[PDB]
């Protein structure tokens, strides 16, 4: 549908960073991008969405994410 959504990653640090992602792109791509941009490794941070941890294989569609939703990240 030539469509994607905007997701925000919010840190303990107060930083919010926006990404665009298609609804059936695996979220690992977004986690890997955030680690590259912020210079962090997967091993130290963890990603959650509406309370729950995020598997690399899961898509926005499968987690029923929506435009302007926020993923939380914890050290």
């Amino acid at each position: 549908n030539n469509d994607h959504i905007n997701l925000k990653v919010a840190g303990q640090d107060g930083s919010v960073v926006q990404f665009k992602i298609k609804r059936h792109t695996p979220l690992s791509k977004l986690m890997k991008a955030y680690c590259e941009r912020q210079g962090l490794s997967m091993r130290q941070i963890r990603f959650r969405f509406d309370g729950q941890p995020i598997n690399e294989t899961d898509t926005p569609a499968q987690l029923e994410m929506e435009d302007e939703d926020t993923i939380d990240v914890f050290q």
Binding site: N2, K8, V16, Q18, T25, R37, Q38
Partner: protein, 253 residues
Amino acid sequence: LEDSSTISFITWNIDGLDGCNLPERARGVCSCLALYSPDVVFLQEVIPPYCAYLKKRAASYTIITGNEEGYFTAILLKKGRVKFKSQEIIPFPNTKMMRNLLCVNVSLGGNEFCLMTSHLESTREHSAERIRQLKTVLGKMQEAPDSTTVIFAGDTNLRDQEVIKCGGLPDNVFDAWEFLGKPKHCQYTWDTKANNNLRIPAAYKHRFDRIFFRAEEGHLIPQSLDLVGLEKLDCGRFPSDHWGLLCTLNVVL
């Protein structure tokens, strides 16, 4: 709040081969750059006196050059936004004008990029070599890893129906201007009626400056294309005989 999904760049042949008004037009270009503050600048026809200007005037860009003698290309990366990964210079074996393909693998917004620029062979009579270089470029864009996003922007010196004869852009390669619907306002990057640098009043105009990019569908989306350097400087001239191109794109994971 920060936007990792929008990258911007300018590509611009700055006519380093025009020695008169060198300091002034140089400052003009740097000011145009400060206005827009792009993440990447692709420069062609840079001379060494023009590089020194950029070191201290645009000191916020790291600078990578395609050569050091005569005139060459250069890619400028915004310090802090762009993370230099590696660099590679691909020769054009039959070049009679020291042209080559400069490739810079970077990170931007956490997205892997391979950035490429060149100043393909010049003049009407060297069309044959210009097409061979385009095929090398087109060719190098596909060698790149599937994971990375390749962007090429340069002074192709291309003429109508030349791309048509070269065999056409390949399937996973698009022209940003064609993608946006061939907009009229930025259709000519070399315009002798609205530009008086070379001082040849005969009204010839071409789309020499072009942006190509490889990417899976809907993963790199051109948002806008605009001329830059439309500002008549103090001497009465423009920063170059070329308009530069400003491009904003969306990166979608």
